Write an enzyme that holds these catalytic residues in place. Structure first.
Site: not given
Ligand SMILES: Cc1cc2nc3c(=O)[nH]c(=O)nc-3n(C[C@H](O)[C@H](O)[C@H](O)COP(=O)(O)OP(=O)(O)OC[C@H]3O[C@@H](n4cnc5c(N)ncnc54)[C@H](O)[C@@H]3O)c2cc1C
Ligand SMILES: CCCCCCCCCCCCO[C@@H]1O[C@H](CO)[C@@H](O[C@H]2O[C@H](CO)[C@@H](O)[C@H](O)[C@H]2O)[C@H](O)[C@H]1O
Ligand SMILES: [S]
Ligand SMILES: [S]
Ligand SMILES: Cc1cc2nc3c(=O)[nH]c(=O)nc-3n(C[C@H](O)[C@H](O)[C@H](O)COP(=O)(O)OP(=O)(O)OC[C@H]3O[C@@H](n4cnc5c(N)ncnc54)[C@H](O)[C@@H]3O)c2cc1C
Ligand SMILES: CCCCCCCCCCCCO[C@@H]1O[C@H](CO)[C@@H](O[C@H]2O[C@H](CO)[C@@H](O)[C@H](O)[C@H]2O)[C@H](O)[C@H]1O
Ligand SMILES: [S]
Ligand SMILES: [S]
Ligand SMILES: [S]
Ligand SMILES: [S]
Ligand SMILES: [S]
Ligand SMILES: [S]
Ligand SMILES: [S]
Ligand SMILES: [S]
Lengths: 421, 421
Positions: A163, A359
């Site tokens: 992740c 994501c």
């Molecule tokens: C920091 C972070 C950011 C993320 N960002 C994205 C994102 O931007 N977009 C995206 O699509 N996904 C993202 N994810 C990935 C993923 O979507 C998530 O991890 C999501 O919450 C996974 O869902 P899940 O149901 O499998 O697990 P969870 O949401 O973790 O649910 C598991 C549940 O089971 C429970 N549990 C655990 N053990 C037991 C037990 N023994 N008995 C009963 N209950 C229990 C826990 O309490 C929890 O409630 C992110 C993940 C993390 C960690």
């Molecule tokens: C979602 C999962 C991915 C990982 C999590 C996030 C990571 C952090 C991202 C840091 C990026 C920072 O850097 C940033 O990138 C884009 C370049 O593509 C630049 O942006 C450039 O493209 C964008 C469009 O996509 C334009 O709107 C912009 O005019 C141009 O400057 C920014 O000027 C720069 O500041």
């Molecule tokens: S991710």
């Molecule tokens: S993730």
């Protein structure tokens, strides 16, 4: 029971909550749906990195489950499962009580494997974590202690992690928060350590120009970055890192002091699930077929981070691919439909469909997002986007998802995509 | 073509031969079925260990393919595929010619990965192999050179191997042949080296009392046995072996002289298949779904040793699980049915069914056989048998299978099991 099956859903998270509603909706009044979970509240996981720098409060991203599911006829037990007997089909809870099931859906998500790295547990060292809201609040607290007494920062992802997005996101908003406090220049060093073979690999061999853009973004913020790293131990407020090369050979070892640290841990299956004989791979992830059914027990289904997905690539330092929200929903939907059909003499033929990773990361006024499918290159969709509109989308989706967890879900869950019609 | 699809089957072995017949039978005269294979003859692989001690002749277990398939309307090309373009759907043969396909079924079996172990290739050392009839004839030849000038014997299986039965079988019939020649006492030492965590693990965590019976069988014949071994190189007529413990740590290193040697190699995917981008795992095995369809290309199917099956266990020294004949047939049947349905607007829903391993080893007057399913314990069938009746069954089945490869196959292939009615 003998003619009105009892369906237990284990885990009330991103996959488990909707699974309970959809399950109840599909089965109707003639069947019992029980939701068991270790916490009595639901948290919106993707918001945790913001909580970890203090841009969000627990109160904004978490809420109590009971009323919302019970008003729907779902029984809620706020207890952690300690043991599962698949033969007898009984679940032993933490308090000793046991629950019987006719069908089990496992949605327990990840065990955070802090033990892979001695000293890495948040409670025994400077290295924090932001995966749960409890850990992110704790991360914020240590962040404030860095403010009062500045020292080196280390953010990144461990060997075996899967992740990576959140690590990059957190590094960026920390850098950002440091600037907004005029405190950024007080930091001796700011290092980013990852097990990825290169920056922006993201567990998926790169998507769009993630490499170039994440690389530049880190340099932009004065963060030094190392790849192909594994942390061997955390000790005396120092992280011991080994960096390898293409063929696993060591090209250097580092000892980094840490005042403030956040490393994404490797995920394993939770112990209750990993403990069920023959159910899981060596990592504790449930072996299932295309239909979400356990390969060993025909009445156990699974979805979310809990299931095993086979690796398609092999990196110098072990890494995994992410399981993200849209794919988790598809798994949930399939498992519900296929259970419903088991209860009606059919064979459910529904699958989760094409592997994909989606994501979205909010950085403040703008965000980054990617979509990749299927898992192996060359892909049919391989996009990395940055902009203000990613931010708006993240905000809208959080608001939406949480509302849906309160109002309830039918539901071909993602028709948020009706913004076309 | 545009309305009468051209189906190419790659590999004329245990899975490919029947796949060609079944394919032709299912598609009828309106479609072209082409069988491409690197050799112009079919060999019955399970008979190779006997060829390697001289109990069987090539002439008894191999025959020319052309007439038998062509009399059935199948086009046969006795040429090795060197390159596959999945985009353009063209196969480049060794001679430069190219073949176009509308559907590809890949049944190319294993590449013998001698390169994992420098010096281990049969042509560059004393360590032979019995997986192909060409190699088994060569093994027999070196066996006769041991007879004339006795020296140490080393038989076993390499790290990453997945086919252990034949190693045990060959060790036993060699010991046996030595006795029948009164030459057994001329052997300085006779060592058995395996990557299995214990004797009789067989890549499947043991079946029945394989541990006890194989253990006793080896001791009975005066064969010294080592487990958790990996050979690092073969050099100067010496095998360099490292033995590890439960946690991968080295507990000893050995240097063994070899006059005569046979180690089962690790299997990889053949280069033409492994070279198709996004088609395969890092080992070169085709990623497929339950229906035998490539996850990346909807008109590429695969079966036999060629496909990837995810590990369910993790051993100190890398080992794999075997892919055996009945399961290969089920994969073949599914792929044919599902292709036929693609040609008729349906979606083929047929799967290979439950994982299983079935192996029969003839020792002379009696044999050993096992059946295990499914892959993970506790199993629904976990039997290890020894007796004279295993020998008779092996003999009968060889006779049967070869006859069927000549007469042709419809066919719900295994109704040999009508010995009940
Ligand atoms: C920091 C972070 C950011 C993320 N960002 C994205 C994102 O931007 N977009 C995206 O699509 N996904 C993202 N994810 C990935 C993923 O979507 C998530 O991890 C999501 O919450 C996974 O869902 P899940 O149901 O499998 O697990 P969870 O949401 O973790 O649910 C598991 C549940 O089971 C429970 N549990 C655990 N053990 C037991 C037990 N023994 N008995 C009963 N209950 C229990 C826990 O309490 C929890 O409630 C992110 C993940 C993390 C960690
Ligand atoms: C979602 C999962 C991915 C990982 C999590 C996030 C990571 C952090 C991202 C840091 C990026 C920072 O850097 C940033 O990138 C884009 C370049 O593509 C630049 O942006 C450039 O493209 C964008 C469009 O996509 C334009 O709107 C912009 O005019 C141009 O400057 C920014 O000027 C720069 O500041
Ligand atoms: S991710
Ligand atoms: S993730
Ligand atoms: C020593 C031995 C003993 C075995 N014993 C048992 C047993 O007792 N019972 C059992 O059930 N199974 C047994 N097996 C396991 C398994 O059944 C066999 O390996 C079986 O032959 C596998 O069938 P396959 O079709 O996948 O591969 P193969 O039979 O190896 O066929 C692959 C074919 O593809 C061809 N090919 C390779 N590359 C190319 C190319 N580039 N272009 C065109 N053609 C190509 C090869 O010439 C070969 O003809 C045994 C395996 C071995 C090695
Ligand atoms: C097929 C894949 C498996 C690996 C390949 C073959 C490995 C070689 C097998 C060596 C076994 C030799 O050891 C042999 O084992 C069986 C014990 O179970 C003994 O046989 C014993 O059980 C059998 C029945 O199963 C009885 O018929 C017999 O009366 C009894 O003595 C033999 O007396 C012993 O000589
Ligand atoms: S966490
Ligand atoms: S897996
Ligand atoms: S791609
Ligand atoms: S071989
Ligand atoms: S095998
Ligand atoms: S085997
Ligand atoms: S795999
Ligand atoms: S078992």
């Amino acid at each position: 029971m003998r003619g009105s099956a009892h369906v237990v859903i284990l885990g009330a998270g991103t996959g488990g909550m909707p699974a309970a509603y959809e399950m109840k909706e599909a089965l109707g009044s003639g069947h019992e749906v029980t939701l068991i979970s270790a916490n009595d509240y639901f948290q919106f996981v993707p918001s945790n990195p913001w909580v970890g720098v203090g841009w969000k409060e627990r109160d904004d991203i978490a809420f109590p489950i009971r009323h919302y599911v019970e008003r729907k006829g779902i029984h809620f037990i706020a207890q952690s499962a300690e043991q599962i007997d698949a033969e007898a089909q009984n679940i032993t809870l933490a308090d000793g009580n046991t629950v019987h099931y006719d069908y089990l859906m496992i949605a327990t998500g990840p065990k955070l494997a802090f033990e892979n790295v001695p000293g890495s547990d948040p409670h025994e060292g400077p290295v924090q974590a932001i995966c749960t809201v409890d850990h992110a609040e704790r991360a914020f607290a240590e962040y404030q202690a860095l403010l009062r007494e500045p020292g080196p920062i280390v953010i990144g992802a461990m060997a075996g992690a899967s992740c990576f997005g959140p690590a990059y996101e957190y590094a960026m908003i920390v850098a950002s928060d440091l600037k907004k406090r005029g405190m950024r220049d007080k930091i001796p060093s700011f290092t980013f350590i990852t097990s990825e073979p290169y920056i922006g690999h993201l567990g998926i061999q790169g998507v769009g120009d993630s490499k170039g853009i994440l690389t530049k973004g880190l340099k932009e913020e004065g963060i030094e970055a190392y790849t192909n790293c594994k942390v061997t131990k955390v000790e005396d407020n120092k992280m011991y890192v080994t960096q390898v090369d293409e063929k696993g050979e060591t090209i250097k070892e580092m000892v980094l002091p840490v005042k403030f640290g956040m490393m994404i841990p490797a995920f394993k299956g939770v112990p209750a699930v990993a403990g069920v004989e023959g159910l899981c791979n060596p990592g504790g992830f449930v072996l299932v077929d295309e239909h979400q059914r356990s390969k060993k027990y025909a009445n156990i289904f699974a979805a979310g981070i809990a299931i095993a997905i086979p690796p398609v690539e092999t990196t110098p330092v072990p890494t995994g691919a992410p399981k993200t929200g849209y794919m988790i929903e598809s798994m949930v939907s399939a498992a519900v439909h296929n259970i419903k059909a088991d209860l009606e003499g059919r064979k459910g033929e529904q699958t989760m469909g094409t592997w994909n990773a989606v994501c979205f990361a909010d950085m403040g006024d703008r965000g980054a997002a990617f979509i990749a499918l299927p898992q192996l290159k060359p892909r049919k969709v391989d996009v990395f986007a940055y902009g203000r509109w990613v931010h708006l989308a993240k905000v809208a989706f959080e608001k939406y998802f949480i509302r849906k967890m309160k109002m309830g879900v039918s539901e071909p869950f993602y028709e948020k995509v009706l913004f076309k019609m």
